[PDB]
Amino acid sequence: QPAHLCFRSFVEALKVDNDLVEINTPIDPNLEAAAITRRVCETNDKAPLFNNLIGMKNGLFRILGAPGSLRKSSADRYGRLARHLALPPTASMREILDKMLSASDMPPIPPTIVPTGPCKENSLDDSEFDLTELPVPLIHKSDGGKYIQTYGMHIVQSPDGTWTNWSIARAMVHDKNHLTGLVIPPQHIWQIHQMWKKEGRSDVPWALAFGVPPAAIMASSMPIPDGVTEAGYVGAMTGSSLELVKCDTNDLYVPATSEIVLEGTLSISETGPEGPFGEMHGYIFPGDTHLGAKYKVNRITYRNNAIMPMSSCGRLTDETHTMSGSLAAAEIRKLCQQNDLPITDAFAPFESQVTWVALRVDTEKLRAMKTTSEGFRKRVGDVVFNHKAGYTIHRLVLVGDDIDVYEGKDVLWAFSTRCRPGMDETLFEDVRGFPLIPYMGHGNGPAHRGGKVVSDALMPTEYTTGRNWEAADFNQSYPEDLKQKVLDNWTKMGFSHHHH
Amino acid sequence: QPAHLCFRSFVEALKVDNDLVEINTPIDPNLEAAAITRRVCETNDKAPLFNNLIGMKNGLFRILGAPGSLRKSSADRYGRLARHLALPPTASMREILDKMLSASDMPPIPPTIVPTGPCKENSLDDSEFDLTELPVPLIHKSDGGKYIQTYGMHIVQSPDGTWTNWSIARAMVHDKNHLTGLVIPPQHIWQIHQMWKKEGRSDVPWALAFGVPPAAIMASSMPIPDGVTEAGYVGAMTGSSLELVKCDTNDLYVPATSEIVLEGTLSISETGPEGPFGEMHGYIFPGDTHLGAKYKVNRITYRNNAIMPMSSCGRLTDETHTMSGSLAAAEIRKLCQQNDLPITDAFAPFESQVTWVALRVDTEKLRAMKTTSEGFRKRVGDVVFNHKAGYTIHRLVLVGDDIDVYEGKDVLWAFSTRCRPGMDETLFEDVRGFPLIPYMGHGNGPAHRGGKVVSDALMPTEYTTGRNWEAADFNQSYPEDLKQKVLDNWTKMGFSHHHH
Ligand SMILES: Cc1cc2c3c(c1C)C(C)(C)C[C@@H](O)N3c1c(nc(O)[nH]c1=O)N2C[C@H](O)[C@H](O)[C@H](O)COP(=O)(O)O
Numbered sequence A, B: 001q002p003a004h005l006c007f008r009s010f011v012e013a014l015k016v017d018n019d020l021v022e023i024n025t026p027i028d029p030n031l032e033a034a035a036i037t038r039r040v041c042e043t044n045d046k047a048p049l050f051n052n053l054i055g056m057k058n059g060l061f062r063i064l065g066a067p068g069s070l071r072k073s074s075a076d077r078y079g080r081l082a083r084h085l086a087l088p089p090t091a092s093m094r095e096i097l098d099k100m101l102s103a104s105d106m107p108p109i110p111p112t113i114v115p116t117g118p119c120k121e122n123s124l125d126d127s128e129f130d131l132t133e134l135p136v137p138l139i140h141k142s143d144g145g146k147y148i149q150t151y152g153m154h155i156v157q158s159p160d161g162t163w164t165n166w167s168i169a170r171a172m173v174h175d176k177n178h179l180t181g182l183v184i185p186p187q188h189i190w191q192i193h194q195m196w197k198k199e200g201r202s203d204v205p206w207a208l209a210f211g212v213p214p215a216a217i218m219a220s221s222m223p224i225p226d227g228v229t230e231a232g233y234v235g236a237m238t239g240s241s242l243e244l245v246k247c248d249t250n251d252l253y254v255p256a257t258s259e260i261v262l263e264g265t266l267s268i269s270e271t272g273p274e275g276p277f278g279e280m281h282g283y284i285f286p287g288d289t290h291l292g293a294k295y296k297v298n299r300i301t302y303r304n305n306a307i308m309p310m311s312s313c314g315r316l317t318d319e320t321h322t323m324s325g326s327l328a329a330a331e332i333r334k335l336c337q338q339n340d341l342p343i344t345d346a347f348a349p350f351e352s353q354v355t356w357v358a359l360r361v362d363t364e365k366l367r368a369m370k371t372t373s374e375g376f377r378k379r380v381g382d383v384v385f386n387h388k389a390g391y392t393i394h395r396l397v398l399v400g401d402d403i404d405v406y407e408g409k410d411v412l413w414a415f416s417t418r419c420r421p422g423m424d425e426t427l428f429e430d431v432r433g434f435p436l437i438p439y440m441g442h443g444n445g446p447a448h449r450g451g452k453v454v455s456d457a458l459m460p461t462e463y464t465t466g467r468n469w470e471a472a473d474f475n476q477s478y479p480e481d482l483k484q485k486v487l488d489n490w491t492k493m494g495f496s497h498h499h500h
């Protein structure tokens, strides 16, 4: 079963890539697994597979850390992401984001129901499991709980049955048979939760599947549109209908090769303590516990020798940056295009802690618009910051065609040199804000509103007659024949491999 | 004669450091020398010494490129700067900037006049030189002239004799016996020029010395205070009185071991075309020629086998960033301290194209002030942006004690996560602006005014009770004994030298 369609095959692919370290000696889920993983993420090392996790019982569970983090080499930097998608390991960001967007104007390929799969190899009922007795990691020393859920997919369906959403949202163990987690607007898990709360009749049927098809966890991390069932989007992207099995205790359907499945309900009434958690912006605020959503677990099913993926998130670079940031940028690119804005590319610079998105402008098309910075900034900000895809992003940086937005150095150069503070910016105070950014939820203003800006790093002639500069760099300030001569004589003269 | 006191000795020091490439085959001053130098600066390679420069005649001249640029290794990144100052080549930025500030509360050590020196080994009068016949470089393909002056020091004295200023300002060849160059407010060359213009009696006696003592070219690049003679500041910093010889045609004094000296006048009446030039922010605007100051050259004196230093400036990283940016940051640190502001460190992030300065705050002292972000931002911005030392800097970023301002990654993290756009910022429109930044002189607003901001990346509790977070990183979110265990078992488990 191919790597992008089966998590167990994906692990084998990483091994074969020489992108995995198998740790076969005992590792403590209390901080040690996550510390190793954090170090990996901070240094772009190989993914750790913890095959011998202190507290693993009857097959639950091994851990794979850093499943979507970066590789050290430039040439296959994004290779772990590529392996989620059947792309060559040398794929560019552009190619990865194009693959993730490709299903947006394709017919869905709905899933196929099969009678069984590996995720049914073992089961534990209501009398046989205790979530506090599993080797659930403590990921950061100040976390408010053991965060079992950092890289599984929540499965919830609208009351009318027409939309089944797959998404990543964190959750931690509350007690032997409950989790608490983030369920916040405008996220689809929250939107569906609200539909069940308005109906008022029952708690939300729920499942949480860990170790799902890698192409599915990518779509789980992406803000594809409201009402769109991720399973059929993944089917179209991959060209293959996903095989799903029914849950035992409800009528939801989970990927047949899921490593571990929890089945139960998301309460429409109950809450419990949730957090704090060491989060994507790089911080934890110890003791900042709040009420979160509360999930009841009725059943666990799992593969033999089940593997739990884990994201040890925080400072650069992990899945929150590589997947949540980049996939939000991809959706923003499409949203802009669909609103007739001349955007060619979008990326959330890692340097920005994925709080910015740089938007590359087709300045030929911009010039034909016969507009101004003030007007264009307002138009872009209204599109993006009024939409869910713009939720997590607080600064949009408009750049012209010379800038590669996938290169943070070049984005920082353009921002720093082409956008006059204040004058070339528009502030947005009456939009939804992202409270997890420290300057929002722990800042001087409203946690949930405002704090957003469009920063125009287009130069004035880019709106009118065309770029009127050349860069003072090797590439642009010397003729081709001289540049080539310099490069050809470089080592001969005494100065100093692409793969490495 | 030591490296920091004698340019010829400094060249030997770079050779001995294995930080020099001697090119002994013919190199064209038309773009080729500067292209090689640009490539060096973009890749942190060894400094190029062009010993065989097409058009060199009777000893004028060899070129040393990249004299103050970066080395590839982290461990001796700033070693070329250290060699300007007698510091070990492993010196930190902090140590370099402390050395440059050290003379600010020392008695000056005035210079010593000696009867002769190497700079008098050869001479060319008014009938014997033609600046258009020298191997003056074309540094960028669109430059408006051949920029002879990128790393010499202009020498001008107040009419009353009490202040002799040394500074770097660009200049290009106008004709056989004149240069044009930038002389702009608030720079000291401009301030002194204005004094002579108000007196109205004569042109400004002037000299331009190339290949000066490295400690002198560092002070030439720093905004030490108005009225302070750089020679005595360098004397105090180094503990040694600098040896100066009189010019032949005027009563100014030049370093005895200067490689090349031009003597003449800076006109109080005449201008000529100047620029465009590929500038420190990374751009050239072809055809953007303006009137600049006009210098008349009456005499050249030079060392046997004279060496002209050259800065091939533009995109990262060259002398404009390493020296002008960092030295302005150093002066800003002191200025803040002298104004009773609790600033411990300042640096101009390279990522910002040295348009930002990050100011590290002693938050214990800030808490005792019992102030607010709005108040404190205004106070800092009023100090810095109303002073010459703040001229080139458009964004100040306030950070707390956990941030190393000499690490751009950490500055970008703090800025992106701790400063709410708009609310946590104060815009300054009624301050002098730096017109060379593209968004100023080629932007949407006044070239010379405004466009400045204080961005407060202090979190709210840093003003009150203290930092209330821990970082979600390896360092802060795991206990010491676990971190050490992970590091000790890192290679054993299968994961992957300081000098490299
Ligand atoms: C890749 C990834 C994404 C997310 C998260 C993580 C990872 C690894 C955690 C490590 C678990 C940290 C957690 O903060 N987290 C998270 C989260 N979204 C939330 O509402 N709540 C969360 O707790 N997203 C982002 C969401 O996955 C995307 O916003 C997606 O678009 C949502 O799907 P949908 O609502 O659009 O269907």
Ligand SMILES: Cc1cc2c3c(c1C)C(C)(C)C[C@@H](O)N3c1c(nc(O)[nH]c1=O)N2C[C@H](O)[C@H](O)[C@H](O)COP(=O)(O)O
Pocket (backbone or CB within 6 Å): B149, B150, B151, B165, B166, B167, B168, B169, B170, B171, B182, B183, B184, B186, B187, B188, B189, B220, B221, B222, B223, B224, B279, B280, B311, B313, B319, B320, B323, B324
């Ligand atoms: C290190 C360095 C500094 C400068 C420059 C260069 C280098 C290499 C050039 C490559 C030649 C580019 C040129 O744009 N340039 C330059 C310049 N200052 C100007 O007024 N004019 C200039 O043309 N400074 C900065 C000044 O040297 C400092 O601002 C110093 O503080 C001035 O001295 P003072 O007025 O404070 O005495």
Ligand SMILES: O=C(O)c1ccc2ccccc2c1
Pocket (backbone or CB within 6 Å): A170, A182, A277, A278, A279, A280, A281, A313, A320, A324, A392, A436
């Ligand atoms: O707990 C987090 O780190 C996290 C990460 C990304 C998130 C994206 C959207 C909403 C909530 C999020 C929470």
Ligand SMILES: O=C(O)c1ccc2ccccc2c1
Pocket (backbone or CB within 6 Å): B170, B182, B277, B278, B279, B280, B281, B313, B320, B324, B392, B436
């Ligand atoms: O020509 C330049 O690149 C340059 C560099 C730094 C400068 C600093 C202050 C004033 C003028 C300047 C000009």
Ligand SMILES: [K+]
Pocket (backbone or CB within 6 Å): A166, A167, A168, A219, A220, A221, A222, A223, A224, A230
């Ligand atoms: K999703």
Ligand SMILES: [K+]
Pocket (backbone or CB within 6 Å): A373, A418, A419, A420, A424, A456, A457, A458, A459, A460, B439
């Ligand atoms: K702009």
Ligand SMILES: [K+]
Pocket (backbone or CB within 6 Å): B166, B167, B168, B219, B220, B221, B222, B223, B224, B230
């Ligand atoms: K100076």
Ligand SMILES: [K+]
Pocket (backbone or CB within 6 Å): A439, B373, B418, B419, B420, B424, B456, B457, B458, B459, B460
């Ligand atoms: K702040």
Ligand SMILES: [Mn+2]
Pocket (backbone or CB within 6 Å): A165, A166, A167, A188, A223, A224, A225, A228, A230
């Ligand atoms: Mn969805």
Ligand SMILES: [Mn+2]
Pocket (backbone or CB within 6 Å): B165, B166, B167, B188, B223, B224, B225, B228, B230
């Ligand atoms: Mn001065």
